[PDB]
Amino acid sequence: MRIYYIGVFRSGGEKALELSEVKDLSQFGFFERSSVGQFMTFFAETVASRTGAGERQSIEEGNYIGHVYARSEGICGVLITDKQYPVRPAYTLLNKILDEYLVAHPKEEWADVTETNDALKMKQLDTYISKYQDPSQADA
């Protein structure tokens, strides 16, 4: 019942553009935080790569769920939390996020971007995944 990774990705064909990438490593101390992180992103990028826009994905792992929410314009977005993390709020998160990514800069201004700052892009998507840690949070 705790999210682990969140971010965005621009469907760049066979591979997903690392639009934005936010991590959540609570149990993954200074030993798994590194390994798991690559796990989260690598998967997050893959999902968006698997998600050819216009559809959503949920990657169920031994103890992880890599939700996926595709845009309606051109740049996709991915989410990853625990199985005990309802999709409904993940949906609203996909709402403010995709709207937040497209808002930060005109619709076409990004279109595909092909170059983003996952390390300092979409402060929202970041703060969201941090507080979203709860099963829902009720947009709190």
Report on this structure.
Belongs to the synaptobrevin family. Its main location: membrane. The chain has helices at 32-50, 87-103, 107-110, 123-131; strands spanning 5-12, 15-23, 56-61, 64-69, 76-80. With 140 residues, the protein is α+β, with helices and mostly antiparallel strands. It has a single domain (1-140), classed as Beta-Lactamase (2-Layer Sandwich), CATH 3.30.450.50. It has a five-stranded antiparallel β-sheet. A hairpin with a 2-residue loop joins β1 and β2 (15-23). α2 runs antiparallel to α4 (123-131). The relative contact order is 0.24.
List the helices and strands and how they pair.
Blueprint: E1 5-12, E2 15-23, H1 32-50, E3 56-61, E4 64-69, E5 76-80, H2 87-103, H3 107-110, H4 123-131
Antiparallel strand pairs: 1-2, 1-5, 3-4, 4-5
Helix pairs in contact: 2-4
Main location: membrane
Domain Longin: 7-129
EC number: 2.3.1.-
